[PDB]
């Protein structure tokens, strides 16, 4: 395990805005166990100094939900920490790779438990990008059997006042 290199000169202002989650690679059981109902997710992203706010949007049983989180910077460009809010333990984050207008591959890790997630500005992703993601997975020592996709449709926006987790 190591902190891999981020996007060179990561521009939070360009990486800002709307991302759709496309696929996740992880050894996390709950993507393979109960891997059905991988409900679609999207981020709104804003810079907030060097930290970034993120609003994940999701459905849950058809109720649209918003989770707002601060990705605190590590003091290092493109490197962030999520807090141990519920004693979950802090999650290290690296913006490994992005075309700010097109695609991103984000590295996230806690307690050596590692995930990589591929987001896009777009419904399609270039198959070359997807292939890069596959090799990113292999380099992370994750199997193809630990890659999981998310549906093309049914993204949500603007969850209700009562359906915002607002963990911060």
């Amino acid at each position: 395990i190591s902190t891999i290199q981020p996007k060179a000169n990561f521009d939070a202002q360009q990486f800002a805005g709307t991302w759709l989650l496309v696929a996740v690679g992880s050894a996390c059981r709950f993507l393979q166990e109960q891997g059905h109902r991988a409900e679609a997710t999207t981020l709104h992203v804003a810079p907030q100094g060097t930290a970034m706010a993120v609003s994940t949007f999701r459905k849950l049983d058809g109720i649209c939900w918003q989770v707002r989180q601060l990705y605190g910077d590590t003091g290092v460009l493109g490197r962030f920490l999520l807090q141990a809010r519920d004693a979950r333990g802090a999650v290290h984050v690296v913006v490994a790779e992005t075309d700010y207008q097109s695609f991103a591959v984000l590295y996230l890790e806690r307690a050596g438990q590692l995930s990589v997630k591929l987001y896009a500005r777009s419904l399609p992703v270039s198959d070359s990008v997807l292939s890069g993601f596959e090799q990113r997975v292999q380099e992370a020592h994750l199997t193809e059997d630990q890659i999981f996709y998310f549906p093309k449709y049914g993204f949500c926006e603007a969850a209700d006042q009562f359906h915002v987790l607002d963990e911060v």
Partner: protein, 49 residues
């Protein structure tokens, strides 16, 4: 994963409680009433001689 945590699932009951019993009920009652009356009389005579 969005999931439910479980820390709050049980409480220890102090010895002095014979019963402690979680149970969700609501009731509401509303009553609303209006009464209005307007009563109006005019009366007039003109007598010319």
């Amino acid at each position: 994963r969005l999931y439910y945590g479980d820390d709050e699932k049980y409480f220890r009951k102090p010895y002095n409680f014979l019963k402690y019993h979680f149970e969700a009920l609501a009731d509401t009652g509303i009553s609303s009433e209006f009464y209005d009356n307007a009563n109006d009389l005019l009366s007039k005579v003109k007598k010319d001689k």
